[PDB]
Amino acid sequence: DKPIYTLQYGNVGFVVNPKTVNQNARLLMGYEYFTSRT
Amino acid sequence: MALINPQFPYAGPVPIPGPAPTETMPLLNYRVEGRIAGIQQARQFMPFLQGPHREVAEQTYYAIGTGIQMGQTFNQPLINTQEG
């Protein structure tokens, strides 16, 4: 309904605060977005 | 509009016994003076109201105010250094 443009309203980030982290723990991040030359 | 019989005609009416002539004459009935009695009250506690009514109800309004308008911390855009 409102895409994260992060050029017309600052630098938005994505936060995960974990409770337990094991060894070799990673965070995979899939994205979906538009792109043009405006 | 009867037709006269010429063979058997008749004459006018003859006298007959009568109905006692004063007993067909009435008296003239003699009214006394009259009065709508009592002292009338000025008003009556009526069972229905005497004014108009309304068929439909209309919604009424009253104005209210909002409050003291504050400032804000906007998220501000990036600088147009030829990327935008």
Side-chain angles (χ1 to χ4, degrees), chain A residues 11-22:
Chain A
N11 281 311
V12 186
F14 180 81
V15 186
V16 167
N17 199 300
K19 181 197 300 289
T20 313
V21 176
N22 295 72

Side-chain angles (χ1 to χ4, degrees), chain B:
Chain B
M1 282 73 75
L3 297 163
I4 286 175
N5 200 334
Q7 209 185 11
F8 304 94
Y10 49 86
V14 296
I16 43 173
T22 47
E23 203 168 3
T24 67
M25 310 170 175
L27 293 190
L28 264 72
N29 259 337
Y30 204 80
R31 272 172 178 199
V32 310
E33 63 185 358
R35 160 166 267 175
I36 301 287
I39 305 166
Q40 286 157 30
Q41 61 199 51
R43 201 182 288 177
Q44 41 195 350
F45 206 85
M46 283 161 156
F48 307 109
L49 270 80
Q50 281 201 302
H53 310 260
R54 303 209 280 124
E55 321 176 16
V56 293
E58 198 189 41
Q59 171 77 64
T60 52
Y61 302 96
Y62 61 95
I64 61 175
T66 313
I68 306 179
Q69 283 165 341
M70 305 191 299
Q72 275 146 337
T73 64
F74 297 96
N75 292 130
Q76 295 192 301
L78 303 184
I79 301 299
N80 194 0
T81 61
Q82 287 83 21
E83 296 219 280

